[PDB]
Design a protein around this nucleic acid. Structure first.
Length: 494
DNA sequence: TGTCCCCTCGCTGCCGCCGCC
RNA sequence: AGGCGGGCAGCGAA
């Protein structure tokens, strides 16, 4: 069973991977694989004078009694530690014990690292997360093809369960499927009564076939364009909106009465279409936040369509922790926020990172932004104002999608993910410490090293000879000073 | 669960405090 | 009104 994984989620001490699978007719559809039996990689560090056999004979009976396990896989293993903890020998033989994430009893208590005993005085790898454990032990390096054997038959077309993380092994295939991309554009208003922002119009620009192997053509037309419109002030739209929308507004325009029906129809379209990638401009910081809050307040039973996991209940703590909550709900669909830290990192020439400015910078095409304030009754009496605002929403969605493909946000993030070994969404979010952490994790784990469990003077600047220098002057720089320094003097943790 | 993007240096504007010519 | 000393915040750069 071959699957190209995209994102992950954790629940009930199990890890679930979201990806695409070729059918018999090699058609690519969404898939979900729930993987059981994932287990923690423990290391017991013996005290001076004791051996892993003593740690075995002492602790494994206690561990089997404690976790209610029939048997526990464990073996002495020589391992190297070269990190910041003191009293840890440079090389010692450890008792490499294997503890499943899901145990019959007391499944969510982690063995303390500082745990002392007569045989050992330290434990390593006791609080590692499920995704870390799988991505390290099975040597997964970013999104890549995945061979699954003994598959046992969410908002994914295929649902798969496997009880052994081993059968799941990465392939050598560098070719990767076509992506279902759905760009988003959102228009909001604050209501003075409750002082909350409310969704007015949502634009859905679908790009069903995007292949990151070959280059993306410029200004590709979306395979489908649909819009969802809500009465901003009154409950009745100005007469003639539908006919004018069909005569002028591009794509389909479907019209509503209230916010609840609009969000329900949005959820239905999201579930039916099943994007792989969600484009947008300031989506994660603003638009996804307001979308989720409006979804929760209006009590839509299908809020889980924004991701690929099927949730009947909203997490109870929802109501500055909303970032993680949104990231967890939207698990399955990548958020390609063109204005986030990664997006800003790929366009340092912009000053405000507004949609118009970034369009002008990346695509060299000028668009004049229009200020839409639906609080003005111009959009409840006039129909031309409503259709102009809808046209602006369509234009914003198209611009966001096009500039997203212009900078290869997805392609760069995928390449750096396969370089780092983290997940695609995490590096899409703009992190830099996560990629470094995971590349070091993979490199040190593959070389028999014990990975650690989860203010100084800088460079020297000279005083300039301030003034004008009419003679020819040269610039003499060091190509990547710090990396070539670390290679030069062989600076390392080890 | 709850995270992050090295500190540190030098540069400019603003604000409040102190002494002075 | 002006120069200096310590403090905060904002930001461009290595």
């Amino acid at each position: 069973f071959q699957m190209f994984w995209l994102d992950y989620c954790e629940v009930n001490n199990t890890l679930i991977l979201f990806g695409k699978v070729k059918l018999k007719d090699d058609n690519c559809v969404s898939a979900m694989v729930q993987i059981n039996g994932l287990c923690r990689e423990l290391f017991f560090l013996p005290r001076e004078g004791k051996t892993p056999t003593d740690i075995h004979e002492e602790i494994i009976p206690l561990l089997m009694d404690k976790y209610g396990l029939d048997n526990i896989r464990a073996k002495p293993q020589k391992m190297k530690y070269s990190f910041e903890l003191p009293d840890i020998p440079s090389e010692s033989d450890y008792l490499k014990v294997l503890l499943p994430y899901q145990t019959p009893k007391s499944s969510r208590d982690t063995i303390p690292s500082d745990l002392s005993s007569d045989t050992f005085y330290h434990v390593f790898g006791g609080n590692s997360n499920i995704f870390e454990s799988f991505v390290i032990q099975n040597r997964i390096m970013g999104p890549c093809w995945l061979d699954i054997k003994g598959a046992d038959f969410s908002h994914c077309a295929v649902e798969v369960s496997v009880d052994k993380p081993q059968n799941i092994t990465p392939t050598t295939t560098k070719t990767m499927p076509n992506l279902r991309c759905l760009s988003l554009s959102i228009q909001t208003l604050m209501n003075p009564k409750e002082n909350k922002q409310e969704i007015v119009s949502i634009t859905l620009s679908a790009y069903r076939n995007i292949s990151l192997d070959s280059p993306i053509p410029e200004n590709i037309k979306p395979d489908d364009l649909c819009t969802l419109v809500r009465p901003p002030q009154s409950t009745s739209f100005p007469l003639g909106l539908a006919a004018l929308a069909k005569q002028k507004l591009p794509g389909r325009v479907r019209l509503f009465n209230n916010e609840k029906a609009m969000l329900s129809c949005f959820c239905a379209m999201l579930k039916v279409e099943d994007p792989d990638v969600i484009i947008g401009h300031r989506l994660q910081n603003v638009y996804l936040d307001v979308l989720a809050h409006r979804m929760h307040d209006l009590n839509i039973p299908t809020f889980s369509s924004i991701g690929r996991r099927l949730r009947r209940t909203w997490p109870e703590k929802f109501g500055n922790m909303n970032h993680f909550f949104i990231s967890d709900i939207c698990s399955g669909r990548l958020i390609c926020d063109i204005a986030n830290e990664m997006g800003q990192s790929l366009t340092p020439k912009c000053q405000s990172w507004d949609l118009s400015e970034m369009y002008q910078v990346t695509c060299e095409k000028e668009h004049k932004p229009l200020d839409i304030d639906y609080q003005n009754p111009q959009y409840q009496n006039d129909v031309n104002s409503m259709t102009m605002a809808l046209q602006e929403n369509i234009t914003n969605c198209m611009i966001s999608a096009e500039v997203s493909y212009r900078i290869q946000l997805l392609t760069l993030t995928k390449q750096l993910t396969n370089l780092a070994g983290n997940a695609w969404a995490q590096t899409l979010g703009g992190t830099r410490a996560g990629r470094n952490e995971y590349i070091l994790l993979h490199e040190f784990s593959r070389n028999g090293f014990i990975v650690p469990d989860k203010k100084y003077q800088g460079g020297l600047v000279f005083e300039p000879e301030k003034g004008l220098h009419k003679n020819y002057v040269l610039v003499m720089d060091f190509n990547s000073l710090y990396p070539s320094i670390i290679q030069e003097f062989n600076i390392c943790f080890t």
